[PDB]
Design a protein around this nucleic acid. Sequence first.
RNA 1: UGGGAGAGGGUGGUGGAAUUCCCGGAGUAGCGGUGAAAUGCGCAGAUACCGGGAGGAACGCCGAUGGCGAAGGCAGCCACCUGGUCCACCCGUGACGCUGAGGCGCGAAAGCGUGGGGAGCAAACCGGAUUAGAUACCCGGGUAGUCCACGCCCUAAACGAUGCGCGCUAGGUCUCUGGGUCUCCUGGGGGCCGAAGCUAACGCGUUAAGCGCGCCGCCUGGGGAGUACGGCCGCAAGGC
Lengths: 97, 114, 68, 155
Amino acid sequence: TMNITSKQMEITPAIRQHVADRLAKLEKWQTHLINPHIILSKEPQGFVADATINTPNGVLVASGKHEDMYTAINELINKLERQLNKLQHKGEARRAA
Amino acid sequence: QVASGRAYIHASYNNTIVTITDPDGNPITWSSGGVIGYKGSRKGTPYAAQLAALDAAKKAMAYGMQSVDVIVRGTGAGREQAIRALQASGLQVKSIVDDTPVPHNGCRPKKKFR
Amino acid sequence: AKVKATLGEFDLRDYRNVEVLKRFLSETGKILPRRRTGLSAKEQRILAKTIKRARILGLLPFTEKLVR
Amino acid sequence: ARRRRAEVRQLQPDLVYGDVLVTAFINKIMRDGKKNLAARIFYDACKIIQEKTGQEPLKVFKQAVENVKPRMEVRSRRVGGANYQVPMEVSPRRQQSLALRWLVQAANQRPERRAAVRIAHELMDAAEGKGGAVKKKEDVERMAEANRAYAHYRW
RNA sequence: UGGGAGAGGGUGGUGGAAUUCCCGGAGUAGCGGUGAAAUGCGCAGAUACCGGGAGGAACGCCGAUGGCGAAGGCAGCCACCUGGUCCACCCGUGACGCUGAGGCGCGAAAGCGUGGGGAGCAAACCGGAUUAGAUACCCGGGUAGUCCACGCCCUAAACGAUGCGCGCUAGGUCUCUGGGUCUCCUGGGGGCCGAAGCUAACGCGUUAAGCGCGCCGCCUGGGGAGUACGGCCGCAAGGC
Ligand SMILES: [Mg+2]
Ligand SMILES: [Mg+2]
Ligand SMILES: [Mg+2]
Ligand SMILES: [Mg+2]
Ligand SMILES: [Mg+2]
Ligand SMILES: [Mg+2]
Ligand SMILES: [Mg+2]
Ligand SMILES: [Mg+2]
Ligand SMILES: [Mg+2]
Ligand SMILES: [Mg+2]
Ligand SMILES: [Mg+2]
Ligand SMILES: [Mg+2]
Ligand SMILES: [Mg+2]
Ligand SMILES: [Mg+2]
Ligand SMILES: [Mg+2]
Ligand SMILES: [Mg+2]
Ligand SMILES: [Mg+2]
Ligand SMILES: [Mg+2]
Ligand SMILES: [Mg+2]
Ligand SMILES: [Mg+2]
Ligand SMILES: [Mg+2]
Ligand SMILES: [Mg+2]
Ligand SMILES: [Mg+2]
Ligand SMILES: [Mg+2]
Ligand SMILES: [Mg+2]
Ligand SMILES: [Mg+2]
Ligand SMILES: [Mg+2]
Ligand SMILES: [Mg+2]
Ligand SMILES: [Mg+2]
Ligand SMILES: [Mg+2]
Ligand SMILES: [Mg+2]
Ligand SMILES: [Mg+2]
Ligand SMILES: [Mg+2]
Ligand SMILES: [Mg+2]
Ligand SMILES: [Mg+2]
Ligand SMILES: [Mg+2]
Ligand SMILES: [Mg+2]
Ligand SMILES: [Mg+2]
Ligand SMILES: [Mg+2]
Ligand SMILES: [Mg+2]
Ligand SMILES: [Mg+2]
């Protein structure tokens, strides 16, 4: 199941749940999101949201950076979406010749 | 019943059909990848053409067929293999003429062919 | 084995001379390339034109099946 | 692997028959590097196949090996958007291995209680074309025969 | 005045290959189609094969790094009408020249009007797949249209992204077409590689993007915008 780490930060069950809510955007692709891991951290210049997820066709590893934590969590999701979609459709790329 | 005839091999990228005619041109029997038992793209293979030419020639021989003229149409995979099989069949093969139809730039082809 | 050589003086504009002309056709009946007729540009054009007229007349084929 | 071919290891002949093959088959009986036990079971089996069938362990075993040798098999190769099962001839090295592996495996699916008995039996049944090991070969051989159409797709 | 090559243009005829449909025959369990399938077609007899017929459209080989045209473009074959262009002769005219704001004509395709025509193809549209979804790509269908006549539209990566004419500045090689004293030379065209030189570089280089004169058109930061308003054109779409 889904695990979130807050590194050198205190975050609420609210913020935690909001992460589950943004991550669910990945269920769109209808494949097994296996032991997804979200990490939240506050660098000098803004927050960082890292995630590492394995699916039947591979791994999603990506990282968001923004002055705003919520905005970084989103940028994380985009990077994850793009990778996941690249995983799911790259195989179709060469059915001919 | 007739001793000599014709064997037409229609060989396309999806299939091989072989029909055996009389000398005048009328069919006595025929076969194809479909009749020999395959569906789908397997019909288009050389092993498909092989069973088709055999099963075609075999049914003919039972009508007293003995010598054939081989006519070939198409540039499909299982073409050349189809010819092997007619030779190996127990049939004579007096000739092998390729009469694949080609236009002198006629009708516009479908899109997939441009 | 160039065709132009294996013949004596002949008319390139003579469309009724089937015996000369029919040598420039592939066994499939097609007009042969310059590399096999040994013709130059200028002459090869006169050839093709008179072969075509000839096929019109019935003297030459438009196509022939390939025997093996 | 990537650079040059692999070299088959030469096995040391077995001291009850001097036979390169009995060695290999012993090994495939061996769990946890306990070779002595692996010999015992094998040899015990031979005693059994001598007792229940008055003819040579060696002669018997060697048959049940020839009868489980797969001559053709399918190996997969994706072409386009389908994973085709391609028919392929099996090199004698692999033929042997498969035969040995299967014999042990089939035997270890048998219901008789002691390891020595099962081996003895699977070998008996396979020398006579019966049993899981031979059944594996046929399944494998039918599978390849069925897919005869894709033979020209072979590497 | 002699000659030349060429899918240059217009009209009228006219040949064979193929596809489709119809008719006849013969034959039966599938055909077709994809990466794999499915829709679809097929025992109410399809596919594949033979013979007959109908109709439209495009002209395989020749064919080319080919040719012709100012450009758009132009290709089976025949005849007629007709343009451009090159060569040789050095015969005639006597600067009659170059460019060209406006104007006029021509202008791929799509599109439009009126009337034909309609085999194949195919926007729209239906359906099958693919896919997370798939208003697509791939598959089965399919109407405009694609074709002809006549009249419109007037756009374009209408490109060599290179305005026209003249003169001058090494050559090497391939090629089309002339005329020679036909080894070879001399014109006109099409490519390549390069001297000098140019150029931000890339590259250009007697087919200049080199060195110069004449005339024309055009640019002056990106977006907003080829939009608005006005005017002119157009049946509309829309154009300037
Ligand atoms: Mg990191
Ligand atoms: Mg797996
Ligand atoms: Mg098929
Ligand atoms: Mg087994
Ligand atoms: Mg009929
Ligand atoms: Mg009936
Ligand atoms: Mg017919
Ligand atoms: Mg003079
Ligand atoms: Mg002028
Ligand atoms: Mg003007
Ligand atoms: Mg126009
Ligand atoms: Mg038009
Ligand atoms: Mg139109
Ligand atoms: Mg119209
Ligand atoms: Mg649809
Ligand atoms: Mg659907
Ligand atoms: Mg669709
Ligand atoms: Mg379609
Ligand atoms: Mg269609
Ligand atoms: Mg129709
Ligand atoms: Mg209309
Ligand atoms: Mg309309
Ligand atoms: Mg261009
Ligand atoms: Mg030009
Ligand atoms: Mg411009
Ligand atoms: Mg100008
Ligand atoms: Mg200028
Ligand atoms: Mg010359
Ligand atoms: Mg000359
Ligand atoms: Mg020109
Ligand atoms: Mg030149
Ligand atoms: Mg050219
Ligand atoms: Mg150059
Ligand atoms: Mg220099
Ligand atoms: Mg030069
Ligand atoms: Mg410059
Ligand atoms: Mg501005
Ligand atoms: Mg406007
Ligand atoms: Mg516009
Ligand atoms: Mg206005
Ligand atoms: Mg303009």
